[PDB]
Amino acid sequence: NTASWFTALTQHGKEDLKFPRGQGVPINTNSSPDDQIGYYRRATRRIRGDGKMKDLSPRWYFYYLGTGPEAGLPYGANKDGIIWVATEGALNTPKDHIGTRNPANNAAIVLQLPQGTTLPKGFYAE
Amino acid sequence: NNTASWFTALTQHGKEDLKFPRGQGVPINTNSSPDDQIGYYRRATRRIRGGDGKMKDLSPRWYFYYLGTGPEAGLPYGANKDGIIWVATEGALNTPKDHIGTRNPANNAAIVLQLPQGTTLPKGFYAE
Amino acid sequence: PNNTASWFTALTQHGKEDLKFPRGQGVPINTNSSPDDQIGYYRRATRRIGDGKMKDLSPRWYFYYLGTGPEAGLPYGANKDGIIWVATEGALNTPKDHIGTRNPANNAAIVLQLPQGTTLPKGFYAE
Amino acid sequence: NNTASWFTALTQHGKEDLKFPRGQGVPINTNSSPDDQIGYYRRATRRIRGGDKMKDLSPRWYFYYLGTGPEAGLPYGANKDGIIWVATEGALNTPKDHIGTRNPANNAAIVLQLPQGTTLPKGFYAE
Ligand SMILES: CCCN(C)Cc1c[nH]c2ccc(OCc3ccccc3)cc12
């Protein structure tokens, strides 16, 4: 059971996540400028109040390029629930030296975005 | 000899596989203690001759089996195997649950599957 | 700076009943804590939010250890609206200032895992 | 279906072949328990156009757990060309089918890391 190294971004709007070119990568003090590349993956949740199945807000999780449930996807690949972000100067290489997070060892880092980053409408962390 | 799941199946309707966050996913079984609440779901696909004549896939069914029981009885919790997802309730025991075993439909109906109250399901899955 | 939060994820309720737990269970699992620190309270949290509607949202309940959180000064079993108390046998009725509260900018919340063999009332769910 | 090693490859740059002492050569895998630390290295040679001919690139050697990989039905110590066996003190002679092998579509490879104090034969590095 792997997980993301960060906490999710919650979606209240009706449009998918979409960062502008150059921003969207979570801050990580252990990574290098070469690693600032990856993708957000949407995860939907449904529960049972008495109207059978209820649809909750989807949450988006970030995974470094070459890691996570779509580790084999190349940067830019079009897939529902996947959006791509990168910081200029990042290498288009897989980041298998970072990998994914094991919850039984490390806890999720609080996702923080760089100064000046713009989140789309209806997107908030925690 | 040839036994079935103790519970009815969860039918896959969406494009996602059946996954469960930690703690949730184990079907309600009043005849079992909280030590037994641990097992796996095994996907079972069915193919049928479609309206054209070529075989078509039916909606996948997911059958729950307690740990150490069912077709993958000889597998430990968290094993990596396609079509096998693992569920456990906080406080379960990582031991084979032979005392429960598997069902013989000749003398035992299937328990209708029911999930704990407030269980998160992926899209395409429904909790009764 | 100056951000205070619960150490655990919230217990949302979509039913019409308030939160209650039978005696001995109701504290969430925390690996970095001792059985002596298994005593605290749940606090209520109201909220509102298609367009053109002031939608009344479902209330949540955040767990705080005894002597911490927005009601740190309250003693165990104190009577106040929106506040219910939980504890397990073998816990000390002492303030858990060494556990404190969570800074949501440095540490992420711990997923609310109830005790081994504890069922929440109808209308409640964890997320 | 088609799967690859869970780790990256040890590339043979010299003429010597892999050989480990009693209790060394198992890569560091946190998910695996001391029960599972047993397996084998399989040599994977690659051919390329030399520029005129076929040139055998420096053979990469991938590690697969016992029972997993392209050599499933082989027990520990099985003698076969291109296979070297490795164990750790306190493990079991069991087909580790619960570990399996990696689908690169949804899993990155773990960087092959060896415990502190491990010895290696000539020409061996991890890239
Ligand atoms: C809270 C869950 C935290 N655990 C991580 C879940 C877990 C419990 N038992 C496991 C056995 C295997 C596994 O991943 C399969 C695997 C990974 C890497 C290499 C080979 C095989 C994950 C797990």
From Swiss-Prot, chain A:
Region annotated Disordered, chain positions: 16-36
Annotated binding of RNA, by residue: 45, 59, 101
Subcellular location: Virion; Host cytoplasm; Secreted; Host extracellular space
Domain of life assignment: Viruses
Effect of substituting residue 21 to E: No effect on RNA-binding
Outcome of mutating residue 71 to S: In strain: Zeta/P.2
Impact when changing residue 115 to A: Partial loss of RNA-binding
Consequence of substituting residue 103 to S: In strain: Omicron/BA.4
Residue ranges that the Swiss-Prot or TrEMBL entry lists as coiled coil: none
Phenotypic consequence of residue 88 to D: In strain: Omicron/BQ.1.1
Record note on what altering residue 33 to R does: In strain: Gamma/P.1
Region (RNA-binding): 1-126
PTM summary: ADP-ribosylated. The ADP-ribosylation is retained in the virion during infection.
Residues spanning the signal sequence: none
Outcome, altering residue 59 to E: Complete loss of RNA-binding
Entry similarity comment: Belongs to the betacoronavirus nucleocapsid protein family.
Function statement: Packages the positive strand viral genome RNA into a helical ribonucleocapsid (RNP) and plays a fundamental role during virion assembly through its interactions with the viral genome and membrane protein M. Plays an important role in enhancing the efficiency of subgenomic viral RNA transcription as well as viral replication. Attenuates the stress granules formation by reducing host G3BP1 access to host mRNAs under stress conditions. May block host chemokine function in vivo, facilitating viral replication and transmission. Acts by being secreted into the extracellular space where it competes to host chemokines for binding to host glycosaminoglycans (GAG).
Subunit structure: Homodimer, homotetramer, homooligomer with RNA. Both monomeric and oligomeric forms interact with RNA. Interacts with protein M. Interacts with protein E. Interacts with NSP3; this interaction serves to tether the genome to the newly translated replicase-transcriptase complex at a very early stage of infection. Interacts with host NLRP3 and ABHD8; these interactions disrupt the association between NLRP3 and ABHD8, increasing NLRP3 stability, ultimately leading to increased inflammasome activation.
Listed name of the protein: Nucleoprotein
Native organism: Severe acute respiratory syndrome coronavirus 2
Whole-protein coverage range: 48 to 174 of 419
